[model samples]
Target: AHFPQTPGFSGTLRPLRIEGDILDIEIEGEVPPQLNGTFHRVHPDAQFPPRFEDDQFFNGDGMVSLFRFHDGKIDFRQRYAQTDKWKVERKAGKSLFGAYRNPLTDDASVQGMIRGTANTNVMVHAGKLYAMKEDSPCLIMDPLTLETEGYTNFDGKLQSQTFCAHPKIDPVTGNLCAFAYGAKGLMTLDMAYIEISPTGKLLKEIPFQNPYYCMMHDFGVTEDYAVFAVMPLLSSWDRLEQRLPFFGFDTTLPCYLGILPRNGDARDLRWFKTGNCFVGHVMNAFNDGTKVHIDMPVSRNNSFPFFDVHGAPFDPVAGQGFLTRWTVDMASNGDSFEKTERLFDRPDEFPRIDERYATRAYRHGWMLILDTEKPYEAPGGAFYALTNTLGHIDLATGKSSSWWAGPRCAIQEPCFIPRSPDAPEGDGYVIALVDDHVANYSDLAIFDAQHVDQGPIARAKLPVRIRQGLHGNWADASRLA
Candidate 1:
């Protein structure tokens, strides 16, 4: 390896090259009969060695992992998202792209090619599966096979340069709502808001611009409004021109939240300013008349060290964040938040809840607790310190219950699957991919959502180690059938 010291190529962030199916995974306990669905997850797994020596972990190609559960059995399969970038590299039999996202550093042979890997997140909607990244077109895939079905532009209706990975699907209406920053060009303030119908048709397409060029990775959606957080992760034109890392956090600027009505134009959007902070994901949001609530895991400073302007080292203590709450009152004279509260002061990320109550008031949310017992490592080290313990927050009582994978385990995002179609909220199971650091293997652990502290009721052993992944989607039996 050219970059033997790079952590992105070894250890937990190491890339996986093989893609196959394990027909019948070994199970430790009986798979819950009620749990009948396919759990799909996407992670960046480099196809070839990185073009650059210092390539970031996020710069790799996307790989989708599928875990189909039915009748006390589970089937596992993995496939690489066949994006334009992946196809070009596979043809050349080597890395053709360069520098994380900046096309300026790419090799001249593949100039102006699609640079996005669609590696960040995955979801199922309107009877189709979408592998998403914020900077490129959404890659459609077969839910059961995990094979790419090419990119989509909503039947030529999507004119934006990119599509967001964190599209919110309203469980009540079955409508998927999403937005994209840098919609016009790299480091441009241009953005677009879109909504797609339950049948996978474009419903609303609105073009807009933001106050600045910020990384709007994810947003929130309520019954009547869509929420966007324009934080200070600013990208400068000069940096891109100089071929330097393009993302930087300006501490002097206040983070802004844009609230747009579901049916309103861009001019009707309301911008509210908040204290200095950065939000990578939103747990849920809701509207109660004039008062709107948004929940997120917010950090006082930049949480991701890779994109920080100062290039500071990872600090688990100072990098810790809270599960915070922000409220906006439309009737107020000022556009600032009506109130701010720290719901929980734990270092957590990758928050998930039963989608049945998404964009509405409901109980129970899950997150991965950042493990700080040991010093954290960045992309160039042996492993990145994400989390080992899974946390469940009770919204009604403001209490939390947790289940840990022990010291030698690192867990990815926890996905909630409802036991039955009409099951009550939080009454199903919490499934997560657990990577055993010591043994160098992975396991799919299923915990009773109502009793996370009691530990996993079942564990399905996998034949290959799944690289730590990003976001995932849970498709129930009805949807998969």
Candidate 2:
């Protein structure tokens, strides 16, 4: 009993390790006729929980679940996205890996294996589904078969060991802007930025170094720029030597918002320094003239308890992410933001927006909110920050609305699905998972985008319970077609 089990592996948050398909899943409300696409989500479903009893929920192996919707019928398929580590551990019939991203803590037999768990975001672009983790290359898979086809480096053009979990797609050119930090091995200064064509071609690669080495989990993309929020989720090899968590927030560190012109190189990257802050998930980016704007949920302290803080005690209250905006001028000589605005004055994270409006000036944003006062029917599941409320904030009007998922459940990240290809922006539905602890089941709730306060108009039921997931997308049928 050297290392006991962690807090995230108990109750409803425990690993299911279930795979395969569930066709014609039970549904209460009728499936909308115009809905035609697949919702791709990846959960860290641990196989041998006993083997890695000390591990946390997010470090578990990826088990992807896709919900295929066509006409009025819905089908489900869930499968493990095998990785180099997972395959090795599966052969040995136990866990060989060590900490989440700490390779030095690994078993000697599996010393040099890839540390990626492929358990973060699931996206579909150019007919291929990408199961992604921020710290490693994306794992490609068949959209129809759900079989892992291994990782890709854009035909070997990407030399970096890692890739982004949330890459933005340019709405105008239909291309993807992908990048990752710590590009030159673990905790290195090298960072890589690549523009991938819509057809999966590596158009160009631009290498740059951040002001500092940090998590940089998510960024923003406007029509003319790639916006980066370099908050202080500091990491170092020394932290590894000290056996500390891979990342920890440093309040003494300053945050930088880097703006890089899409058509330029590292020389043109402009970093605007700001006071110390914390950001969790990006909403989107937009620019006009020489002014650029990036939206995200910002906090004053460490929002992620998993990543410890450097100085003073962690302030969960101040650490709560509030939807905010950072505006900078590309032509300014100063090294600071033009201004900052508090759009939504409440705590929320896992920000989302209309995909069609991405990289462009637009409105409509959503997130999962934590309302601690809500009476709990049971202990919370998965997240350290309980998300019992769903939030929809309209930036155009600087107004917001929310849907509290009752006192018996927790809400996961919310994704947007357009009503039609040509429908007006935000003329769509919102979809998210509702883990009902009291009912001992989970549900896929669909709500009108503009009216989330009204709650789910439809609830797709799964008699079988599933663990909460990370990030995902609703791939329109045209993308699948």
Candidate 3:
């Protein structure tokens, strides 16, 4: 009977926690003939009223949505990931966990249980879908039916408590290159660099530690290295004991870009001071022998107001993120970054590039731009606070373009679906969900990847509310099946 009416739990961000399917969604225009795949997305939806009213918006349950494009028709389905926490909470008919990532607030009956909501992102690899959260083990599901198959440790090969939410799929090797911090346990300095074959087999699990323990939300991969952008999103036992936020941004700390050779041991990590800046997600990365470049959304201050540390004031002006490139030179022995450049001036997060150019040099990039210049509205869920435009940038010419969802609607993360297996890079359709605050519903908007400024060529309308979502991916029907 208790529910939090906080800013994130009411209005557009309220908990719907629904599961159902709708077929042959009404399309307003011609659906791209070559677009045959499932666009998988996840939203952190609370399954029960949270134990704490001030809980983080990201602490919701994983509601996985699938939009399958078959022939000229589209099918829609959304289901819960049914993670351990979801099942446990469902059985109890209430929330057993406490505050976000704070075990101290959990019900005593549910102590020592895994608290991962699997609510961050979804990807289809090895014909199995992974509902992932950076804080706990992964939950596997069927790509077609959206059914849960329990957690996987690669046949008992995984010994870590967490895996990264954004694992880079090495385009060169076709292997999943990923790492997890707090491997030994939460708040520990331990980390694990994990390698899994494209066929769902664990190849190696390397133990490593960060220069310091921070969020480490994402990293980039090149042909010869896995690049880690270490920022000041600090955490500590002191903060935990003090019951502070599990993560807090410390402005005094200097940022580092740690480079680890793909084939080298843990000791080979070279921590190069890149100075202080906030990097959200990697758009793409590539290396040319000793020179490496990482493209992402870089801000001058912490983006999370709730993640403020030590009573620090949030810098809203500096919190806005722009596409920036931080480059490092292994040849230089100065232990510092060689150069930093702003790729695109438009502020956005959730950066993406064509998968074919993932681990190597990339040309085109896309993101959800928070065009604050337009009419504003706080959404029901945390869709990067606010994103009303889809942005695309040309790396070579430093040119950019965008399409706005008008004043009352906001855009979700855009997933790029290549026209075919061998299509030229950036030659694809961009798929994203637009939440119409006025209509209280959502639609799948498809755009010509390079010409997104022209707006959607087709709009598949969903009569029901889909809420807001975080990150998502495009899995060709061939990969999901």
Candidate 4:
């Protein structure tokens, strides 16, 4: 049989476990300074390498960090996410980070004036985490220690591909099942998986039909299928439109929350695309907390207008990138599905609203706090929507009132501690990784899980500036199993 799927690294597929009082979570991601310059053009079909002012490759920008947060403190270790870890030869007037060895433009045999340096890329899995480094294999590492664990390379040497946003480990089998972001021209398709052991052994690799977009950020699964959200991959031409300001254009990428059945072979996957919905910066397809939800933006097709840098093009800020709403849907029957509408609305282009204003979902139907412009143009930032505090949605009313929101630094995804049998009334607390771009410092903001608006009971300052946004887990009540 002609198989369209291949085995690669599992960095994007994180590990999850729950033992005793700890809900261990783990995920791998490329670190800070992620893609520099006008690096917005990161797709495979990019017209030209990102335009950089300092003659550096956008790929070489990030410094990967394996992170773990517990006991209200954030711990991290840095590994080379995109830079050279090997002592390879260097080409003159070119960088391994950039592809400038006589970079070309069009077919006129025209010389390529544009070139980009690349960073270390790999495709393999070791222990707790997987990394797709620039020229290396995907290696797995412990989320807390940042130590190399094992390596699985079915895609061969340095074969780079996309890992699913987060992986869902089978609770019954203790095996990991995930999807791979297809490489080559296989737009939005996935290579499904069923990993049996920790020896980097592959049980099955299947080509999954991801109807919406293959590059899904986070997804979840039921006993038989996966419910994942995928954002469209903007063509090179379309992303250029995003760089422009104030121009109205379509940013909708036919997003979807597909269901892939876990029956039959990996290649025997099926999917159904949900219509347009706004998902936030971070997504998790397989959250086990009964309700299924996505972070929806307040408005659909939000547009900004501006002149093209090279040509007069209709530049627009497409996609669900703004103050978002929270929604939930259930998958009971094969085709039966229900979706609640957007829950919140925040101004998209507020002065203080930087890219870091991304959102995440927690125990309650609450969303993480996102601050845009400061109140009355003050020093810090304005208070915005609060997630954990909103408590549970009334499923009937469709209104999620605020539990907390005020003048606080833009917060990272909040960690939720489930209510233990000992303290049923306390529920849990949220551990937020907070940072101030102005002060250039990072700290922890712990909020009452029941009342997100309630101020932090404890704040622990980080040693250095932990870049604002990222993806990860809290493995092992101490570490993972």
Candidate 5:
């Protein structure tokens, strides 16, 4: 926590618009065709063994699909696929949302490589970002060729020094920041931004160590802050168990937001209690810099603790979950800063209750939360425009008015984009990578951001069933402009 450490951890990114008009990649994962964990909460009588493959829940490894929506034409392909052998078959519990990616270049120039492990955040430096490819090896690649330029192996200890799930680049400084989870607590990984010249040496290694876990799920970052959703680990068992803890076990036992001063040392660290909730992504933080809004899943009822591990469910509980926001201020003690915020208190309403629906931001001060009202029935999940533009939601009157509701299965997280040049502003709508459970088709749908309820602008059906939990980038009119 003294000085910044050199030789940081892994990093990643996605292409917004590559080459001409047709180069954006949609990366995601799928479930095993066979055994999966049984639905625990839905049927309490059933002693559902958490099967890694059975449940087909949101955590399965997905296939990376790429598409080039050029002119009125659209071309697509699946990138870096997964095979049965590479898939873990044991009762091991893995992150459903563990895989994270980020772009290292613009103009389809190049891409960065990194994954969701125990690290903090990785950013584009020089040309490549450090990337850990599971247990294969740690690699630095040219995002464009998807080819490795540098790599090193630490036997099988990638988990030891490079364990993390979040890696991002600092936009302003262009420094590569990564976090790692270790026996000694979280370590920060930092890399300096340098130019690549003819004789220029890239990735010469700067002092690394960000002071927080980069792998924290649903993480958040800002211009002045590198926030981590940290919980004090009771022990290594707690650490392992924490990864795939049975639901409702208070996995967030000591849940707090650990703030790391972006440019300061680790000791300059501060923690803020997030009180009773999980971490969420940073969409539009900073209401004039002092306060920021963070989205997360807040427990409403006795939340159930369940995990689909090797087809067996463990540590039973009966709890409820809801999507809410956390508003915090950045307070400084000279060197380090602290976050002062509380989770938004809302009962009976959840932002993303269902497991499948995807959610992303839209124009006009609106973000779409995709999910259904009814959990059991199909097509129950709908899209709602979370409007903050019309003044903040009066907690007493906070309710979801549907923007796009459908009778199909959808997890709301994909970045929707209309490929046409003449598409309206916010027009080339938000893209959704969804599955039609009824028809058994894995597909991508484009819905006008301005009019969610309206039928999709276009739907691209896939040849396979895409399991839950995926991430990627898109090229929009702005990129072209």
Candidate 6:
């Protein structure tokens, strides 16, 4: 009876894999001329029912949704990433994968198959689109059509068993910087540093052993340094050998901030210890003299209710996330990293900035504030943390503004697009997908970057529902063509 109706696995959070194209989506207001691009996003969607009754929402196959805007007209298209795992399961006409990442729980037929879903995030670079997951290589796709082209190894140059979903693209240099933890093997502390040229060529692939094998979900990069947050969410070979899930927040271990020169070797890396905390996303980072600064949403303890950290139960209030900054002094001997300030104490995550200012000092940012007027209730679990409110923060003025989509809507990650490449930091628009759960409808909400509290300047109506997704990117017309 409970097999198909869990909190994260049922209702709007449920997985659906279908593809189609719609022309001239209904828009409320005139589409801004500056908003001429394609907004593409990826999310996990199961092709068939989960083999196991209790499966994570993150384990499903990838589905990409795109919104194309040009000359005030908008077109919508969606398709599956056609990952190898998805193809095999389609041939079998059933779900072959089991639990999140435990191979021992999988079916015998697909004992060692490539299990990546490529479902977490999507990005465009060097004139091609890539669907990414933290557990597999990037899946290349046709930027304009969302057609899968196959996975990439950077022309057989990438050797890591996995790749990170959150890769940083330098706005000025156009270089792509990324890293992968557990680089060596399952439950290992090794990490791989990677960089790709603007034209999509692999420039460097360096390996370094980490102080601990933790989940490095996202990292940061500046003009001079690449930063990684080594949180206390520990995984180990011992846990995997015991056939147990490979993650737990080890309170005994202190978190770390690893800093490496953007152009230097791994030997130039330095680690600074910080307090016990967890970071799921980084807003932006920058270097000024010998200090490196990173702004992100940090939680005091494990925020994910589904993942158990040892036997620690999360307190809803204490585990709430905050907009915080960590300052690291490279000039210090050791342990120079500290949570210097709390930007704001609110339940927020999925921070988005005008990526044109990525790896640099950005004055404006946007994030979802989960402390909404009407909280989102999970189908069969505790209240979920996803929200219907958008929180806009002005870093220069320390003033914050917000807009809530009433009580019926749940908003997805917001992506900021600059009016022009050379536009001022906040002179742009914030585009987000808002799903009205009560009405069973979805719409694209566009807000002026500086005045989100006033609500959408324009709204694009979608005839279908798109489940809450992880990450998305906005590609200009030139980049897509």
Point out the worst 10-residue segment of candidate 6 by lDDT. 377-386
Question: Model 4, 234-319: lDDT tens per residue?
Answer: 22324333442211222444555555455566443434344554344322233334344444333343222211122334223342
Query: Runs in model 2 with CA error above 4 Å?
Result: 1-5, 50-53, 306-314, 380-384
The regions of model 1 sitting more than 4 angstroms off are 1-3, 306-311, 373-384
Tens digit per residue, CA lDDT, model 5, 41-108: 00011011222222222222322334445444444543222222122321223222221121111113
Model 2 per-residue lDDT tens digits across residues 1-481: 2233456666767557888888887888878888989999888876665444556556888988898988877888989998888888889887788877888788999876677889998889878998889888888898867889998988887788888898888888878788888887787878877788888888877888987778878988888888888987888888878776677787788999988888899999998999998887889889988899998888888775545444555566887888888999988898978999988877888889889999888888988887776767676444456788998888888888999988778888889998888899888899998988777788888999999999898888987777878898988788875
Give the 10-residue window scoring lowest on summed lDDT in candidate 5.
38-47
What TM-scores do the predictions have?
0.96, 0.96, 0.96, 0.57, 0.54, 0.95
- The TM-score between candidate 5 and the true structure equals 0.54
Better of 1 and 5 by TM-score: 1
> TM-score of the candidate numbered 2?
0.96
User: Per-residue error at 378 for model 2, in Å?
Assistant: 0.6
- Give candidate 1's whole-model lDDT: 0.82
State the displacement of the C-alpha of residue 7, model 3, in Å, after optimal TM-score superposition: 1.5
Which 10 consecutive positions of candidate 4 have the poorest summed lDDT? Answer: 34-43
lDDT of 6 by residue, 256-363 (tens): 888998778789999988777777689999998778999888887866564555555666765678888889988878677644788876788889988888898878
Cα displacement (angstroms), candidate 3, residue 431, comes to: 0.7
As for TM-score, the candidate ahead, 5 or 6, is: 6
User: Scored by Cα lDDT, where does model 4 land?
Assistant: 0.36
TM-score-sorted candidate list, best first: 3, 2, 1, 6, 4, 5
Q: Is candidate 3 or candidate 4 better by lDDT?
A: 3
